[PDB]
Amino acid sequence: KIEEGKLVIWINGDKGYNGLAEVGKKFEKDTGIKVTVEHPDKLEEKFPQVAATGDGPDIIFWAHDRFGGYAQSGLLAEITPDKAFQDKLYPFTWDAVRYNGKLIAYPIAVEALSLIYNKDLLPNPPKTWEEIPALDKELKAKGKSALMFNLQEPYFTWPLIAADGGYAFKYENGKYDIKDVGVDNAGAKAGLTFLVDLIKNKHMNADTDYSIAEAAFNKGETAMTINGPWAWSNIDTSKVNYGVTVLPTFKGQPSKPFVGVLSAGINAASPNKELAKEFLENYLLTDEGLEAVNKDKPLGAVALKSYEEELAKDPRIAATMENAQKGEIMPNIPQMSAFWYAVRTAVINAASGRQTVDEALKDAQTGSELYRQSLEIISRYLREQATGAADTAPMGASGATSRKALETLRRVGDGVQRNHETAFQGMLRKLDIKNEDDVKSLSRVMIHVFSDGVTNWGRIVTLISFGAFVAKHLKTINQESCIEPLAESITDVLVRTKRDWLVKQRGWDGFVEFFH
Ligand SMILES: COc1ccccc1-c1nccc(COc2ccccc2C[C@@H](Oc2ncnc3sc(-c4ccc(F)cc4)c(-c4ccc(OCCN5CCN(C)CC5)c(Cl)c4C)c23)C(=O)O)n1
Ligand SMILES: OC[C@H]1O[C@H](O[C@H]2[C@H](O)[C@@H](O)[C@@H](O)O[C@@H]2CO)[C@H](O)[C@@H](O)[C@@H]1O
């Protein structure tokens, strides 16, 4: 479906897309291949939908956090640069784009938020978040405000939520404990409560978004903002005497921004993969290519060592790296999209007063844990049904919920398979499942049948029960390796299509209560 002999690129509208188009024109001059750069709204949400049907751009740019989910869905081509090329970029940038041992994108630049301040209003920035209410009172008396930043995207509030101990997925001993989510701990509550109190005390407004905060800072109305390197170009045009510095501390601890590596992935459905690799390696990831993008909107600390050696001399880049070192590189696990949606809703609801901080972060914790919790129950049920023996591994975090949900699923799911054996057997025979490809075909039908019907626990149990019925068949035909992917497929469609309803039921605790 993607046209051969051209390149279509998607990049966010806050990045240097006109500079990127200049690199595309240089590519066309040599090869005669036209390069079209687009910046659609919500491109990070559109890409997984359109690429799943074989459509979409040839190349997608986004921070690396979204790319593990795309790679898990088979939407990205593996990238295999030679050693000479790999050595030109910092190794930690390649680490950001590695998923299941394979490189799935080219790293471009390292982005971290910093505190940006107007030196003409505030010659010295505040070192702590705690002093911002008094600074706002002093500035309000002269017709100014202390701080405005985007409150609609959780990326900007995360540094404050993480400062006193909030975390997305625990990281210790060089590994993630994906079962350990920290969005509703005391640290996360303290940071979000601080933000909500700034709004309650009229130091900030819940409706402030990217455009509003940018306009206020660039017009000299607010003394400070929180933003990344891409914002510096518009501040330069405004002529505000600005500085870029370390984010304020909270409870004496540094603010911890989630660090993104802007990366370029190649669509697995592209018939232009070799053209895309040539464009990215030999035109974009060069001093001249990155300089073209950087001159339109600054990239941050670029992954290309030769160019970064020059950019690192800029005090704004040193401040960006200082904030990056105090924060953490984002995970790229497929559940990052769910974590971001959950925290986005939590911040918006707490800031507006729709939910208290406790209610908001409890829902965010449920939403963030949903995939792993659902897979634990569904995988265990399918495998024990297929083999006749249960998994001996400990349940882990939220073990009581997992154990009680599995006990409930055994009672209700066994009843579904018993009573509906006729239709289940008839469907299993019509599907003629013999291998991995037949399981993938079953999964596509399963998605639309499940999604279009009514949302209730009885239909959710039927979906999972049919999965167990298929798992028994897979065991019989020596295709036991197909059971875990089937469990992942069932988990995917459940948590993706029914996300809001599942969170509203308190997840699997609601299921246990419903069938008590
Ligand atoms: C109060 O209610 C409850 C309380 C406790 C527990 C359960 C319930 C409950 N509450 C609600 C419903 C049901 C039982 O529903 C069924 C039980 C058995 C069969 C059907 C349905 C309808 C149901 O189906 C599904 N529900 C949810 N997710 C999925 S994903 C999926 C599915 C579909 C195709 C695939 F390839 C793979 C998977 C189906 C599905 C839908 C229809 C199906 O058969 C239709 C008849 N065919 C069979 C084949 N034969 C040759 C011709 C006649 C079958 Cl077998 C399946 C598995 C499906 C529904 O849509 O409501 N139970
Ligand atoms: O707000 C959640 C959002 O955060 C990050 O997105 C950043 C992006 O990394 C920056 O390059 C810039 O565009 O600002 C975005 C925030 O508006 C994550 O990369 C993204 O996945 C997540 O949804």
Author numbering: -195 to 320
Sentences from the paper on this structure:
The prosurvival protein MCL-1 prevents apoptosis by binding to the pro-death BCL-2 family proteins. The process of intrinsic apoptosis is governed by the B-cell lymphoma 2 (BCL-2) family of proteins, where dynamic binding interactions between pro-death (e.g., BIM, BAX, BAK, NOXA) and prosurvival factors (e.g., BCL-2, BCL-XL, MCL-1) ultimately dictate if a cell will undergo programmed cell death. MCL-1 is a prosurvival protein that mediates malignant cell survival across multiple tumor histologies. The large, hydrophobic, shallow binding groove of MCL-1 has presented substantial challenges for identifying effective small-molecule inhibitors of this protein.
Our efforts began with the generation of a crystal structure of compound 1 (MIK665)43 complexed with MCL-1. This compound demonstrated high target affinity as measured in a FRET assay. Inhibitor 1 makes extensive hydrophobic interactions along the BH3 binding groove of MCL-1 while also forming a hydrogen bond between its pendant carboxylic acid group and the side-chain of R263 in helix 5 of the protein. Although compound 1 is linear in structure, the compact and folded binding pose suggested that a macrocycle constraint could be incorporated to orient the molecule into a highly active conformation.
